[PDB]
From a paper:
The ESX-1 type VII secretion system is an important determinant of virulence in pathogenic mycobacteria, including Mycobacterium tuberculosis. This complicated molecular machine secretes folded proteins through the mycobacterial cell envelope to subvert the host immune response. All ESX gene clusters contain at least three or four ESX conserved components (Ecc), named EccB, EccC, and EccD, with EccE being present in all ESX systems with the exception of ESX-4. In this study we report the molecular structures of the periplasmic domain of EccB1 and the cytoplasmic domain of EccD1 from the ESX-1 cluster.
EccD1mt (Rv3877) is a 54 kDa protein containing an ~110 amino acid (aa) N-terminal ubiquitin-like domain followed by a 30 aa linker and 11 closely spaced transmembrane helices at its C-terminus. We grew crystals of the predicted cytoplasmic domain of EccD1 from M. tuberculosis (cyto-EccD1mt) which diffracted to 1.88 Å. We subsequently solved the 1.88 Å cyto-EccD1mt structure by molecular replacement using the EccD1mt segment of the MBP fusion protein. In both structures EccD1mt residues 20–109 adopt an identical ubiquitin-like fold characterized by a β grasp motif and an anti-parallel β sheet with strands in the order 2,1,5,3,4. Interestingly, the asymmetric unit of both crystal forms contains two EccD1 molecules and in both crystal forms the two EccD1 molecules are arranged as a head-to-tail homodimer stabilized by an extensive interface. The interface is formed by interlocking side chains from β strands 1 and 2 and the N-terminal α-helix of both EccD1 molecules and ~650 Å2 of each EccD1 molecule (13 % of the total surface) is buried in the interface as calculated with the PISA webserver. The interaction is stabilized by 4 hydrogen bonds and a cluster of buried hydrophobic residues including Met1, Val54, and Val58 resulting in a solvation energy of −13.9 kcal/mol and a Complex Significance Score of 1.0 calculated by the PISA server. Dimerization of cyto-EccD1mt creates a wide open-ended groove bordered on two sides by the α1/β3 loops. Notably, the dimerization interface brings acidic residues (Glu45, Asp49, Asp50, Glu57, Glu60, and Asp61) from both chains into this groove. The negatively charged groove of the EccD1 dimer indicates that it should associate with a positively charged partner(s).
Author numbering:
A (entry chain A), B (entry chain B): 20 to 109
Amino acid sequence: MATTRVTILTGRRMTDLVLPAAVPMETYIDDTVAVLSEVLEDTPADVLGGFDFTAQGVWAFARPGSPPLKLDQSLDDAGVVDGSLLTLVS
Amino acid sequence: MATTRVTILTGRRMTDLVLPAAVPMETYIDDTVAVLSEVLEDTPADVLGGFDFTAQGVWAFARPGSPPLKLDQSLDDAGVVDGSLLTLVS
């Protein structure tokens, strides 16, 4: 399985992940959010810039400050390269 | 976020995955199965040894031939190390 290294920015915190490169983002985004919520459960809120893992609505990846990537596309389709910064948006 | 590379056995096929080592298995197993479903979607049926992605219960990881690991535990809790062989069972 091809993979890509991405770093998720949550406020000031960076978290490095290894994600499937060629599978649509919709296939794994929900459990990604769930994992990151556990990983950052003890992190102070001011450091997370108030980030809410319990936000309602449809989660997607986005390059910081940009419109969200299409969930039916893979990271490869979206041109995401190793070490790219992404955010989680809903 | 700690990770451990595991080898998932499906029939005669072995597929390496980098999984979160420190969060409960139940946090990511469902999307792991979904991802693996896409990755192995062109694998010939005889290589798959009757492995079925259609669940007969709640999915769990298991060391081949052993009782399934508890979903509330992490890979670390289960003593899983790099290149540990695991299967998916329901």
